[PDB]
Design a protein around this ligand. Structure first.
Ligand SMILES: Nc1ncnc2c1ncn2[C@@H]1O[C@H](COP(=O)(O)O)[C@@H](O)[C@H]1O
Length: 321
């Protein structure tokens, strides 16, 4: 019946209530019944009556009953630099990129291979198994805040899944690409034209437009998808290598692509690149390349991290036509 418990009760309740507000007005997918949700609000209202100090303009009860859900794209910092990637359009370049690697830091290096989904970058900051910030790439130190928009992608869990093999990290910042599916892209386009709205020229643009909405509910109606493909700052998770990292991601419920393979040498990499050149079309989303990452985390550190690029990864891009 004192300030310590009073503050605690309210904050816990506010967050619980605000989230149910957001899951009902935004999303159109509430996890609790309206019967229940109404009880929670009552409690918060009760405590608010008991203590008027808590009544504020930013409280769900005092000034915002179903409002206060907008995205202003406020600049926000990235915990770790989110760099872009060097590209390779010819085999010589790939070989050349992979000369430095095994000119220096020799052999222990395995090369993880992944598909290159040409979508929109997204950086999610997970704090204590909770999603607190979602941001765009921007310049690679600072991005735009799309917390609310990003909270609606079906593929992004709001909370990490606790697991024994992989304990939930304290601060997990994971990068990814938000994209459509080809079929869904067309459907959305036809929806827009029914509304007398201009359709999008390609899925990336659609990807992007759908994500950057001032009103997050708009973003909820559209079937945006997300893969996780990298990690930034992390506390309480020192994954030995990047392939093992994906194991943890899956354990926590984060989306991971199933076309990633591990290649011991350049020959294995080459095989994948030749393979994906002929089977790129078969995938449900746009794939314009193959990203080859020197996988061992330790080796990544030993290798450079140049201005606006990493030295331990090369993106082989296929010719458009
Ligand atoms: N393994 C990956 N698969 C698909 N896309 C990736 C992967 N890694 C990085 N990306 C994205 O590709 C971009 C690098 O190409 P770019 O931004 O054009 O310089 C990154 O900034 C990410 O948005």
């Amino acid at each position: 019946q004192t300030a310590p418990e009073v503050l605690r009760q309210w904050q816990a309740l506010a967050e619980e209530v605000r989230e149910h507000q957001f899951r009902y007005y935004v999303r159109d997918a509430p996890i609790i019944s309206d019967a229940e949700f109404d009880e929670l609000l009552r409690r918060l209202e009760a405590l608010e009556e008991q203590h008027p100090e808590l009544r504020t303009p930013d409280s769900p009860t005092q000034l915002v009953g179903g409002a206060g859900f907008a995205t202003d794209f406020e600049p926000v910092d990235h915990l770790e630099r989110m760099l872009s990637l060097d590209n390779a359009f010819t085999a010589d370049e790939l070989a050349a990129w992979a000369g430095r690697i095994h000119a220096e830091v020799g052999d222990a290096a395995h090369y993880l291979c992944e598909l290159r989904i040409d979508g929109v970058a997204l950086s999610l900051v997970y704090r204590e198994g909770r999603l607190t910030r979602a941001s765009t790439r921007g310049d690679g130190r600072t991005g735009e805040d799309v917390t609310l928009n990003a909270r609606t992608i079906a593929d992004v869990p709001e909370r990490l899944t606790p697991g024994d093999d992989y304990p939930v990290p304290e601060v997990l910042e994971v990068r990814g690409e938000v994209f459509f599916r080809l079929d869904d892209f067309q459907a959305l386009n036809a929806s827009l034209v029914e509304e007398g709205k201009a359709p999008f020229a390609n899925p990336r643009n659609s990807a992007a437009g759908s994500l950057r909405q001032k009103d997050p509910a708009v973003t909820a109606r559209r079937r945006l998808r997300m893969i996780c493909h990298g990690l930034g700052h992390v506390e309480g998770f020192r994954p030995a290598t990047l392939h093992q990292a994906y194991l943890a991601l899956r354990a926590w419920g984060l989306p991971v692509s199933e076309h990633t393979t591990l290649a011991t040498d350049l020959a294995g990499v080459r095989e994948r690149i030749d393979y994906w050149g002929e089977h790129r079309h078969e995938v449900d989303h746009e794939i314009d390349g193959v990203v080859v990452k020197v996988d061992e985390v330790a080796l990544q550190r030993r290798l450079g991290s140049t201005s606006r690029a990493p030295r331990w990864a090369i993106a082989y891009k296929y010719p458009p036509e």
